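Hi support team,

I'm filing this because I wasn't sure whether my run with chloride ion finished correctly. The job status page said complete, but I'd like someone to confirm that the output block is well-formed before I use it downstream. Pasting the exact inputs I used:
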Amino acid sequence: LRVPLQVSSAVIKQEVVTRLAPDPVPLTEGAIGIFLSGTEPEDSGYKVIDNRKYVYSEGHWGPPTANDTIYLVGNDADVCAYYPYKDSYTDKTVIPLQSQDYVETEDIYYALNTMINGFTPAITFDMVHAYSLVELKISRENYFMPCEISKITLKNSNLIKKGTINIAVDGSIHSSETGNYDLTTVTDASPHTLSVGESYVCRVLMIPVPLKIERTDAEGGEFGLSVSLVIDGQQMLVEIPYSELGEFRQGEKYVIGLKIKGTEIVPTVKALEWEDE
Amino acid sequence: LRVPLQVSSAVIKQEVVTRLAPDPVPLTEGAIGIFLSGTEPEDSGYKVIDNRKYVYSEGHWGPPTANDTIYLVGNDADVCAYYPYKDSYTDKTVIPLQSQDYVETEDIYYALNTMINGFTPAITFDMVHAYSLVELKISRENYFMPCEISKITLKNSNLIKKGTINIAVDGSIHSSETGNYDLTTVTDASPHTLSVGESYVCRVLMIPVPLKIERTDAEGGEFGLSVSLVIDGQQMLVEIPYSELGEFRQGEKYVIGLKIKGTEIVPTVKALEWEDE
Ligand SMILES: [Cl-]
Ligand SMILES: [Cl-]
Ligand SMILES: [Cl-]
Ligand SMILES: [Cl-]
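And here is everything the job wrote out:
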């Protein structure tokens, strides 16, 4: 005897950074990918379900057709989910991640395993962001050249370029490629000219990682992330103090303001007697 | 009946800029040029003496030989002088002036006419500077290029390049050529590379002149002098506020500090919740 799984809602978990989290915002569009496996007993009483698509329709999440229904029996099952559904994401333990310029459909949320059975078939998926959001806000002040940006690179030896996340058990990320991140929104082929009074915003989905202290100066000051920019053919490096940014944490947004101040001659005037004393 | 002129001393008049003037410093070397003409009566009783050389020797100013002695009679004479003596400066009403890079022998002092006769033949020449001294102090901060200076120009429509001064009657300056002043100590042929921590000092003998307000910005702020510098092939203009420097006054020194601050990217970091509110 079996009853259908009841997906009550899929809500977005807001991280506590500057304020306490209000009631979570429910997802009211698109599709989720659901995984089910029988809880470890050796017959669990369940056939494995990998990446079953559930769609939001008429105020609730449900199977697109009756044959897509996920059923629960008296035995316990481990159920996890992610959003937005992707047809090829067939293994919950190795869900792909890639640091990239922000694309809304690439912003993945996941809900770790919940133990559930047919006696209490109702579930709420508490969706956490898999990535960090890095937001660059680039402006000009007293700059008298075109200010054409042809390259933007995020630098730290710990940055993860590619990896996978286990959305079922612990949300642990397996790194497959590390190194500096080059933004694709601005290139030598596709450059961006920053105008006077313009605020140029570049958003990047970044794989969460603690940053390495890359430099300690004579005064003891520590530096983690660097931002390299090619402005009017000239490479400019910006060092971010480690105390200000030491880690990219899951579900947090880091707004990095970068104000380009052009070469300046500061004058001082003092009128005096011809011969000093 | 005649007695020799007695040059008691030739002293430097210090201008009152920041402190009151102490006892004037006496000139104790070199030579002065003396002019004598009979005071306006029509026979004055004097033959005109133009640019007579007097030399400092054995603690006093005097003629190099007995035949060079300047004599005074009962009748009044008008006596003026300048330092340092120049063999060709034969007309006291048109003593040449030229704005130029500082050269100590080009730093002219003059004492206006004193009425004197054989009853009181002792004179003290109160020597005033004919020029203003402009002193540029050029430094670097956060500059990552060679910082090779190939040109320095002082800019204002009122600047006098060449002229003459009447050292006898009033010290009034007759302008013969106006315009911007180009320093000769640094050229494309002869450039200067400013090193890290270096303070490059450029001194200029400038013909005294009130400066013109060359620009008034939207905020009402007024600008007089400009300093144009060609650093690593790039022309850089520095505007001096008119309130800070409105005139080049005779015998005053103007120290103009110019700190070259290279292009800088200022970073700001704020960690936040992913979705703002
Ligand atoms: Cl059934
Ligand atoms: Cl000096
Ligand atoms: Cl005699
Ligand atoms: Cl966003």
